[PDB]
Amino acid sequence: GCVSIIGRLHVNQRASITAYAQQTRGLLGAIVVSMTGRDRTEQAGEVQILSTVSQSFLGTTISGVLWTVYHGAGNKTLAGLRGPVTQMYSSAEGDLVGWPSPPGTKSLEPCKCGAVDLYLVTRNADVIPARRRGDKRGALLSPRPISTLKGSSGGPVLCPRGHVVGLFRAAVCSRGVAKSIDFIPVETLDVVTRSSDNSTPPAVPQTYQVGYLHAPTGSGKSTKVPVAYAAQGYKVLVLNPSVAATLGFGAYLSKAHGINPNIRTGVRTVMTGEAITYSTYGKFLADGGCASGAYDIIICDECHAVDATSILGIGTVLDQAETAGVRLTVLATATPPGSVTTPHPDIEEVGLGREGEIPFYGRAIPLSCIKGGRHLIFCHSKKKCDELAAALRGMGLNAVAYYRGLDVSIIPAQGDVVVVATDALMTGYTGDFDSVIDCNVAVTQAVDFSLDPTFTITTQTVPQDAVSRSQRRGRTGRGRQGTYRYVSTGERASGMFDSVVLCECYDAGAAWYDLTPAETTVRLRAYFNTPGLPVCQDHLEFWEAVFTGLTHIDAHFLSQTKQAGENFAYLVAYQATVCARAKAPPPSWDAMWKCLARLKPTLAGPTPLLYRLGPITNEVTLTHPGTKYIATCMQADLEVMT
Ligand SMILES: [Mg+2]
Ligand SMILES: [Mg+2]
Ligand SMILES: [Zn+2]
């Protein structure tokens, strides 16, 4: 996972800027350099064309530092003369990354003459003129298709004298037309060049503050630390994403410390009067958020969690805490952004070799590892799960596949078994195993602003990050020894998540907590405004607008889509109510649309399509005012990362 250089730009003064582009390395070279992390060849130019094999982007060297965007390079090293080169600067919040610039490269100078005329140099050596709009943007003289600007993030935005005004990072669009340019000002680069240690619990301040606790899981941050706070006379609230963890901590304190704390969950609530409360983020929200004068300290545990409820809970805390009388909010996680996973007690970790009986993502599984006992194998796709469970059964093993669409009772409670599953198991299941085998491949949700007619919710296959890695291997060694086998080390904990998550929050907020869109915004704003958390593109105003227009949802449909656990229960249920009210069928007849089963014989004609949540089987009309509303929301200036 190294970044390699596959080309370069020469940027000099004669529009007065001239640029020349030069491809220098193909796909074989990029893969090899990327895998070895070694590049022995000479370097040159003011801008570098960078590659992660799949995708490509730019980097500009200024003051001996090769700068580029975080949304392209992440936490990756740069291939170098001697081997991998680690980042010298890194800010997900600034969407910025920097390495020491390879020798042979030339620097551009920052602009200190405050020009209005701006010039973007693309990956193809095109110079695009613009005019400055405030601090981080420019209005293009000639609007252009957004497609022409993709792959050029990290390129320089120049003044008429050739100094760098900023780094191109995104386009501001009007339904696919790029009207303006968004960039990282050079002034941001200076600030970043000046910057640690959260290892131990923050002290309780005299006035409200947010603090941080970065320590391993089970280390006691969820048990010992609350007790230490309470023993000083404070009332403590501990929030976790899962029911099992919440219940688990309560039971521990009882059995081990002889302390019986309060427990609040949807499935079980126990109030004892103690000064320590354990709750889920979900139950915390359903309870109305922060109650006045109830707690001195709120600990937001597992704050690397980017599921909708976790984000809403955390953002609610950060918005309401101070006013409710809290002295200290603690944001606690083992895997903060940019961090690696570290070994965990009792869990042996052993990379897979190339020898065995069952091929597995470029490695092999020996039968010995899984014959006898209970084992969990993570596969990236339904298709692969079925294939593998089949192959194992033909070798005399009790193997069984699990993915979304199947029940969890398919998994025997005891006796020998090999479960081969997707991440669907995480939400769907609770129990654990004697070992985990991990393909280290992650499938994540993404939104595509596709304009066919509006937005599409689809997926992405990416290398596993530290958070994912921890979750999967956490499925073994619960209370006792476990074993974790893997194909590769992943990437460091991601500092950035997709816009589709925002969509998920507004959906969940409305579906599960009756939150108004304007109110969901306030809470997400708190989340964004707090440093040290994962960041996102600011599409809050966009998503607020579209959900505001989705009025008068059929309650019965919303109920069923909720039972069925649809990640976007509200968007689905809503699509179903327009179809029903139109006497039209759903876009397909996937299980997604169960709720419309009984009415099938009564529906016909084209479906009024609002957005795409999956494949389309039936004829569709783009006519519904619901479609036109969402579509006109997308005409408003929308920042698209490039
Ligand atoms: Mg603990
Ligand atoms: Mg943790
Ligand atoms: Zn200048």
Side-chain angles (χ1 to χ4, degrees), residues 110-115 159-165:
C111 186
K112 294 175 200 175
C113 60
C159 83
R161 290 171 163 164
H163 317 329
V164 187
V165 177

Side-chain angles (χ1 to χ4, degrees), residues 11 36 77 372 392 500 577:
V11 180
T36 61
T77 60
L392 299 186
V500 74
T577 109

Side-chain angles (χ1 to χ4, degrees), residues 218-223 249:
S219 67
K221 68 183 168 58
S222 304
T223 42
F249 294 137

